[PDB]
């Protein structure tokens, strides 16, 4: 899992 | 390799560039009518037409893109990020596949002749300035 | 609807489910092959064969998937999860598209008769345990 | 002017790039072959074949490029940039002329059909995984 | 191996040495003429003539020479010897390629018989001392 | 990228 922009 | 998916059927991306993006119906609606009208033949073990052959692949590729973006947004914990992702999808790949499904469903239903003449007539209608643009836009009809 | 992309050509997903992932070439390799061998016809304004139609569609769909994956990897700034999602992409959809491209290219080259017999025989060989099958597999080739 | 040296013969840069670059013999070896096998036909006052004409012109162009490169190497002093220019030559023009000489010599010796089918076969081969291809690389032979 | 590019067509480097070096037009003008008059035949997939074969190969070799020299000039930091490099290139290879382009274009436009007779008659005209040679030199023409 | 003569 991740998150960005 | 540069392949035009409509050059095979008698059209081009520049001929469908006449129609605006906002013109094409939702993928939900297009798949609904595709089912209701050609499910038995899309699930058939036959080459019924190149339009059937192409529409099958389009449907499966939409499914693959949906699985991709779903799995991705799920791995994405932030709502702004996933919403950005699906917005980009709907703008680019959604529009591509709406063009495609619309073209194939419309052609199966009406005819290459009718659909290409419809493209040119709609280009005329959308190029006409508003003061002289009939409010009744062109519409495809078996009636 | 539930569409099988090979039922229209005389096969199934369970006839190609036996072929292992190690069997299929890279997508780059298969696209290079498709270009070098049939680009004249794939860029042609003709229905040359349902195989040409399907292969055009498959190439365009893989291109859309690649555009999405590149845009995502660029926007996202985490390389670990980047490689994770592209690993999902490959493992899942590259396998499908490899099956697809291989099937169409091989049918065009050899024949549907030949490709289906080869799939039957390779399935016999792969369901067989190693102790009881020949060491070297069946081979579809132009020498 | 967008000229393809092979289109006049039945091939393409894309098809000859379907083989790997480390497959083509050296320019020295290919010129030795051309001499040994077709010197009296290339030094002849006859249009013996388009392949003969093309081979003559290609040999002469290689000579011109070699003269230029030798003169340049005399001029420039630093082994670093000297090896750099040698690298650029043998990377771009070296490969072009290797492919060209190979194509023409091989067609003269074996047949246009044979050489083109060999291009295709060897490309498919080098792209196929080993466990599912014939173990020995295709070789072009007269015996 | 010693190949003469004109022996195959009925001439030689001695016959084309009747014409002086300053006689031949610029390579740019000769290429413009070649385009103008035989573009669609030089870009064609046909052995239209040995002259076409040769002209294609020569155009490509000239392109390769120019590519090399351009990469060189742009990758070097000394713009002083860039005068002698072009001096040599022109003086040596530009003359060869002008002679070649001229011969091929002229033997395509006017014919072998006409071009050989022109070479002979212009050799007469130029061997003749100025006090006894007309001002209307031989001109290669259809009128 | 250096020249002489």
Numbering used by the authors:
A (entry chain M), F (entry chain E): 405 to 409
B (entry chain A), C (entry chain B), D (entry chain C), E (entry chain D): 1 to 143
Task: Quote from the publication.
The capsid is composed of 120 units of HBc dimers, assembling into a T = 4 icosahedron. We explored two distinct binding pockets on the HBV capsid: the central hydrophobic pocket of HBc-dimers and the pocket at the tips of capsid spikes.
With a K_D_ value of 4.9 +/− 0.7 µM, the SLLGRM-dimer (**4**) has the lowest affinity to HBc, followed by the P2-dimer (**5**) (K_D_ =1.9 +/− 0.4 µM). The analysis recapitulated our earlier resolved sequence requirement for HBc binding and substantiated that the minimal sequence SLLGRM is the major mediator of HBc binding. To affirm the capsid-aggregation property of our peptide dimers, we incubated solubilized purified capsid-like particles (CLPs, spherical capsid-like HBc multimers purified from E. coli) with an excess of SLLGRM-dimer or P1dC, applied them on carbon grids, and imaged them using cryo-EM. The less potent SLLGRM-dimer also induced visible aggregation, although with smaller aggregate size, while geraniol-treated samples showed minimal aggregation, and the smallest observed aggregate sizes. In the nanoscale we observed clumped CLPs ([Fig figs10]) and resolved the binding of both peptide dimers to the spike tips ([Fig figs10], [Fig fig5]). Binding of an (**4**) or of (**7**) splays the helices at the tips apart similar as previously reported for binding of a P2-monomer.
